[PDB]
């Protein structure tokens, strides 16, 4: 027939893809690095405590200054905190109490959040009269709101667990270009470095990676067995690594096409809720439903340390741009500044 | 049915024909992107507590 | 003592409890008293569209009062050359064609019956309905009738509620009282039956009956009758507050003044007789007609008393032998015949010639064996003397026959055959309606034993009580009638003054915003819990608390109720919420509607997030 047809031609051009892949698969990751020192034992304290959400935290964004950080919480609120002094600039009560995702604007201008309302709410910072008022509801997504990120103070990407992801224009408050592909709820996205291309990670199990001016998918990345929960981008833009439900992370080569490594361990049992690098790339430090954030050597895969600090869940993390500190946001309703 | 598998034929035809580079080239430019910016790494190298905001800058 | 307004806020619990059972509508609102009285201070004071309708319906309502035809050919004239009326047939909501056509129709020919303009109170509530309403219940004065209604649905009487002074009555079961109310100041009769000799002489059934019967008359305002305002019990005793009547009853002013002439008879007759008509509309036999169970108050007017033996024949006409048996009317002595409301008017033309002779009219010479006065009622007719004037002849004649099918009041009409009696012709039934006959007998200024019937071993058990559990009840109509007639404007002033002062004190505080708007805030209110007395605000996800003087920062999360159960604690009904860790969350209301209301919220939310959460990948629990 003519499903018969597109069907296996389909299954065919999978095993294309896969043996092209393979063609590459040269040397691994580990065989290349074998030469370079072990990081040693990563080691931090923690320098701040911040104390204010009356219930679980679900995210936290980092400002561009390395200094203001907003995060999300059960208890309806977003609160933004000066990480230096532990103070909050603004405690800001929602609309919806199903918060569930956060950001920060790199202006530093707005906010946005949203969660089961599938509503992505912007939040202005600096009102021309004084006060934080919501600015736009952007409503389109017909499934929550997983996750969001600002391109400029007009344009922010959402994923959604009606299984796409979405450019929008703020002013207009329309969707500029919807990316469609996913079979499973998106759960997270990253933003290459230079905001041309993205990356989402689904309960499909999958990555893919976008182009936003043209709007397609450009390379889909499997290898996980359960929820990517979590993904982010290597600092160069050339990879990036997910975080699962399996209790592995995984790095992903873009140009390569294919997996490099896998980040595990046998004692290791539990879902990765999130995942950051540090400034230079050779840290990969993921947050674990065991309580604990886990710190990688990326290029070794081996375990530098562990972040042992809250009593539940640790479901965000960030690591700042100038690279001097990770934050813990966590089920127990503290985030922690470690350093 | 028909329209969603014609769909899915083109996006793999997009999926396969791009340019690929060996696992070893690049493995070897993460690694040089790590040696290069080690030491702008407060995590990796840890800094005096005089330029540590969280503690004594 | 006194009534305490909750605060306004109540408004968030009691408008979802009113919602729930469909009271907030302009039907169920506008036909209450405190509702009228706050919807026409909206309307005339708040809101110019419909101030001038509701000034319209006052005069009709004040023009349906006017006794006599000259007074309404006068009044209607007034009316329809009137300012109100040019401002309403001259404006963009106008009375039709047919309305003006109707009442002009008439108003021309001079009928001016009581309800000349019935076609234009249905067309100012039809405009009162909808936007008009919605604008009320939006405002401050339906937050107001959620603060009284929250009193009314919160009533636990208890004897020291009330100012208990001499005795006025008593019978088999108890004693009746001369009291004071004290909230209100409201004078009242207080019947106390005692528990102990309701067993010993086992009348539970009577004195449960006599409840029931009193709800099924207590509205309506029938000059006429004793009615209930409240039922209420203690550990031993039985309460009834009724309609004060220190004057003795007819037992015990017929034996002291002897007889009365029929001129007298008529004044008491009259009374009687729309005293049925009123238990009989509403599908009531009394059954027990008799003197001692007619009331005189301190005029010498009268109401009928002791409702325990009457019974309801809306369902299930009754066949019982009830009664006293010099007034039992045929159809009842016979056990099998079904009767109604025919048994009274039977009673009436008995208890009527006793008044006049001292006797029943089947009673021959005392005759103290009660199968004598049985088999008189059914076999013979009874021979009216000669004393006896034509029309009271035709009336007893009347209502004395055997035969249901040919008894006064029993041919399809009902008193209206009684009332058209020519023993009655002198009668104008809207004077006697009014009280404007002068009565034959003022009872003497503080008599003793006027209202007396002719007349430690016992343990009440748990499953005794249980017998009177459903027994205490409030009539509303009467609790809002008493109120209004009261304390309802001057608590209204004082509650508006101490409202006032909290807003502008908490202007200068700092704290203007509420905590519960622009969220998704469902419901809040003051409770105690386990004791602090926090102010607590419920969301979808979560239930949060605060005290005074700071925002929320206590809650408890849906996610982490497992339960929400009614408990006791100490005679009080408390919430149990039981928490994931094994732990305990005990919750007490300060009114009834708040515990329902709580419980039904509480319920819901905890299930439906408990739903929800667990279709959430980021949200719910994992292995
Ligand atoms: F428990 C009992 C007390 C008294 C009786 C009385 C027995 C004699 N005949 C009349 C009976 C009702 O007496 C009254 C008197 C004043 C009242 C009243 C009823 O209601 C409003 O104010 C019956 C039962
Ligand atoms: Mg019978």
């Not at chain 3, 409030?474 to 008493?482: A, F, G, L, M």
């Amino acid at each position: 027939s003519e499903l018969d047809q597109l069907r296996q031609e389909a299954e065919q051009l999978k095993n294309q893809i896969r043996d092209a892949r393979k063609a590459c698969a040269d040397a691994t990751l580990s065989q290349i690095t074998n030469n370079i020192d072990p990081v040693g034992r990563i080691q931090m304290r923690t320098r701040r405590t911040l104390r204010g959400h009356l219930a679980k935290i679900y995210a936290m964004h980092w400002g561009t200054d390395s200094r203001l950080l907003v995060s999300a919480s059960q208890d309806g609120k977003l609160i933004i905190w000066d990480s230096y002094t532990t103070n909050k600039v603004h405690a800001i009560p929602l609309r919806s109490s199903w918060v569930m995702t956060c950001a920060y604007a790199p202006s530093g201008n707005y906010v946005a959040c949203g969660g089961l309302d599938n509503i992505c709410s912007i939040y202005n910072l600096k009102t021309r009269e004084g006060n934080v008022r919501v600015s736009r509801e952007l409503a389109g997504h017909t499934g929550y709101l997983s996750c969001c990120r600002f391109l400029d103070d007009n344009q922010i990407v959402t994923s959604s667990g009606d299984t796409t992801c979405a450019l929008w224009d703020i002013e207009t408050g329309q969707q500029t270009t919807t990316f469609t592909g996913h079979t499973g709820d998106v759960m997270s996205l990253s933003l290459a470095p230079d905001t041309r291309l993205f990356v989402s990670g689904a309960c499909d199990a999958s990555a893919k990676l976008w182009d936003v001016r043209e709007g397609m998918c450009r390379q889909t990345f499997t290898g996980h067995e359960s929820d990517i929960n979590a993904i982010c981008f290597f600092p160069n833009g050339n990879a990036f690594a997910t975080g699962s439900d399996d209790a592995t992370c995984r790095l992903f080569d873009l140009r390569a096409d294919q997996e490099l490594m896998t980040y595990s361990h046998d004692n290791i049992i539990c879902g990765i809720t999130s995942v950051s690098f540090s400034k230079s790339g050779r840290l990969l430090l993921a947050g674990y439903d065991d309580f604990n954030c886990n710190v990688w050597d990326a290029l070794k895969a081996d375990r530098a340390g562990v972040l042992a600090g809250h009593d539940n869940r640790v479901s965000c993390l960030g690591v700042t741009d100038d690279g001097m500190a990770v934050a813990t946001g966590s089920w127990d309703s503290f985030l922690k500044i470690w350093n | 049915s028909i329209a969603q598998a014609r769909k899915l034929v083109e996006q793999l035809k997009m999926e396969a024909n791009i340019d690929r580079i060996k696992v070893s080239k690049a493995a070897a430019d993460l690694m040089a992107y790590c040696e290069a910016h080690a030491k702008e790494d407060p995590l990796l190298t840890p800094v005096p507590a005089s330029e540590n905001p969280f503690r004594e800058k | 003592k006194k009534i305490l307004l909750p605060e306004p806020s109540i408004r968030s619990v009691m408008q979802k409890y009113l919602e729930d059972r469909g009271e907030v509508t302009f039907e169920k609102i506008f036909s209450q008293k405190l509702g009228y009285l706050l919807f026409r201070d909206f309307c005339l004071n708040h809101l110019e569209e419909a101030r001038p309708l509701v000034e319209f319906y006052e005069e009709i309502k004040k023009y349906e009062k006017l006794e006599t035809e000259e007074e309404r050919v006068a009044r209607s004239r007034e009316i329809f050359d009137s300012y109100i009326m040019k401002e309403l047939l001259a404006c963009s909501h106008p009375f039709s064609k047919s309305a003006t056509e109707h009442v002009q129709g008439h108003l021309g020919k001079k009928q001016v019956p009581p309800d000349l303009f019935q076609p234009y109170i249905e067309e100012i509530c039809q405009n009162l309905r909808g936007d008009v309403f919605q604008k009320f219940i939006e405002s401050d004065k339906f937050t107001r009738f959620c603060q009284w209604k929250n009193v009314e649905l919160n009533i636990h009487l208890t004897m020291n509620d009330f100012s208990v002074h001499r005795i006025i009555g008593r019978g088999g079961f108890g004693e009746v009282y001369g009291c004071r109310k004290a909230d209100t100041g409201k004078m009242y009769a207080m019947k106390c039956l005692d528990k102990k000799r309701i067993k010993m002489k086992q009348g539970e059934t009577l004195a449960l009956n006599e409840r029931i019967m009193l709800s099924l008359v207590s509205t309506g305002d029938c000059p006429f009758i004793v009615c209930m305002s409240y039922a209420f019990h203690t550990p031993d005793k039985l309460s009834f507050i009724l309609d004060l009547m220190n004057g003795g009853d007819l037992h015990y002013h017929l034996s002291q003044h002897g007889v009365f002439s029929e001129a007298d008879m008529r004044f008491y007759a009259a009374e009687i007789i729309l005293g049925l008509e009123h238990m009989h509309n509403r599908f009531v036999v009394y059954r027990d007609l008799k003197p001692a169970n007619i009331l005189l108050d301190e005029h010498g007017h009268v109401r009928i008393s002791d409702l325990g033996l009457a019974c309801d024949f809306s369902k299930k006409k009754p066949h019982a032998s009830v009664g006293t048996h010099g007034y039992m009317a045929p159809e009842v002595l016979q056990k099998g015949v079904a009767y109604d409301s025919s048994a009274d008017w039977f009673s009436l033309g008995c208890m009527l010639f006793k008044l006049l002779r001292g006797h029943s009219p089947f009673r021959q010479h005392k005759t103290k064996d009660k199968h004598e006065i049985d088999r008189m009622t059914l076999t013979m007719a009874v021979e009216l003397p000669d004393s006896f004037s034509p029309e009271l002849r035709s009336l007893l004649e009347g209502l004395l026959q055997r035969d249901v099918n040919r008894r006064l009041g029993c041919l399809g009409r009902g008193a209206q055959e009684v009332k058209e009696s020519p023993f009655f012709r002198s009668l104008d039934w809207q004077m006697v309606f009014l009280q404007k006959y002068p009565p034959p007998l003022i009872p003497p200024r503080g008599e003793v034993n006027a209202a007396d019937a002719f007349d430690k071993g016992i343990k009440l058990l748990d499953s005794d009580q249980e017998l009177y559990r459903n027994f205490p009840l409030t009539i509303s109509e009467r609790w809002q009638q008493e109120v209004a007639e009261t304390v309802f404007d001057t608590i209204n002033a004082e509650t508006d003054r101490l409202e006032a002062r909290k807003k502008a004190k908490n202007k200068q505080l700092g704290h203007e915003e509420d905590y519960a708007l622009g969220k998704d805030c469902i419901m809040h209110g003051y409770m105690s819990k386990m004791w602090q007395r926090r102010y607590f605000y419920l969301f979808p996800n979560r239930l949060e608390w605060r005290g005074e003087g700071e925002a929320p920062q206590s809650l408890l999360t849906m996610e982490e109720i497992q339960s929400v159960e009614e408990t006791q604690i100490k005679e009080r009904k408390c919430l149990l919420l039981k928490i994931r860790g094994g732990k305990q969350f005990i919750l007490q209301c300060d009114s009834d509607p708040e515990l329902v209301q709580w419980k039904k919220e509480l319920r819901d939310a905890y299930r439906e997030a408990q739903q929800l959460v667990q279709r959430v990948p980021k949200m719910k629990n994992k292995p």
